[PDB]
Amino acid sequence: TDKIDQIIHDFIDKP
């Protein structure tokens, strides 16, 4: 799931 968690890390970036 780590490789996925990196991809979820993309759109949650600080607005």
């Epitope: 799931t1 780590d2 968690d5 990196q6 890390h9 949650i12 600080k14 607005p15």
Partner: antibody, heavy 122, light 109 residues
């Protein structure tokens, strides 16, 4: 199984840089964002700053000029540097990870190590 | 900046009763990113619920969050003595991050 190990200098004289550091076991810097908060004694929580593995840092709008946070994934650790501190900054500093709050993430919540009491006194 | 107003700010209840804590956002929260922290005196805070309705691991089902948009609420059912502490509501959706002024849950006598 993530665990955060924080070490830093508790006692400092006024107008001295505050350097604290927090270490990450069990998880990568790239997977989760990291942030630093402080709780003054018997008062509400305050969020000083947040950091990403890429070096991008977003700071509380009040303290922006004084605070700078730097993170190095090489050692899997991130450090908070603050300058021109004053007695008003006396507080207990906690290094935490912002809430994930998504179904897909592993260990979907947040965990942090025991805060370091920082006392600024002449 | 989203200012957080917790109410009433001091809650006096007794074992067996139902506790309702309120947290209100100055501005809309688009992504429903909210959390609730339990802090006992002299002890580090423990995150309790995250998001809107999601409960953190290690806590009984009697703690339940609800709400959306501008208004959020935390409910404690059949409170045991160990639940009394100070509770903060936090918002990670939109920069800058902010915490609520806190609600003190005390034991009625």
């Amino acid at each position: 199984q993530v665990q955060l190990q924080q070490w830093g200098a508790g006692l400092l004289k006024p107008s001295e840089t505050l350097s604290l550091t927090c270490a990450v076991y069990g998880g990568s810097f790239t997977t989760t964002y990291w942030n630093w908060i402080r709780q003054p004694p018997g008062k509400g929580l305050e969020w000083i700053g947040e950091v990403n593995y890429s070096g991008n840092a977003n700071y509380n709008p009040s303290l922006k000029g004084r605070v700078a946070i730097s993170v190095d994934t090489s050692k899997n650790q991130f450090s908070l540097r603050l300058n021109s501190v004053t007695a008003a900054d006396t507080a207990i500093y906690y290094c935490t990870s912002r809430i994930r709050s998504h179904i897909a993430y592993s260990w979907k919540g947040d965990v942090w190590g025991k805060g370091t009491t920082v006392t600024v006194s002449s | 900046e989203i200012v957080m107003t917790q109410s009433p700010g001091t809650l006096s209840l007794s074992p067996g009763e139902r506790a309702t804590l309120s947290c209100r956002a100055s501005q809309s929260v688009p992504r429903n990113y909210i959390g609730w922290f339990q802090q006992k005196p002299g002890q580090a805070p423990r995150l309790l619920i995250y998001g809107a309705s999601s409960r953190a691991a290690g806590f009984p089902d009697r703690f339940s969050g609800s709400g959306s948009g501008t208004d959020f609420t935390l409910t404690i059912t059949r409170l045991e003595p160990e639940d009394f502490a100070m509770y903060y509501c936090h918002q990670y959706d939109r920069l800058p991050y902010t915490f609520g002024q806190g609600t003190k849950l005390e034991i009625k006598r």
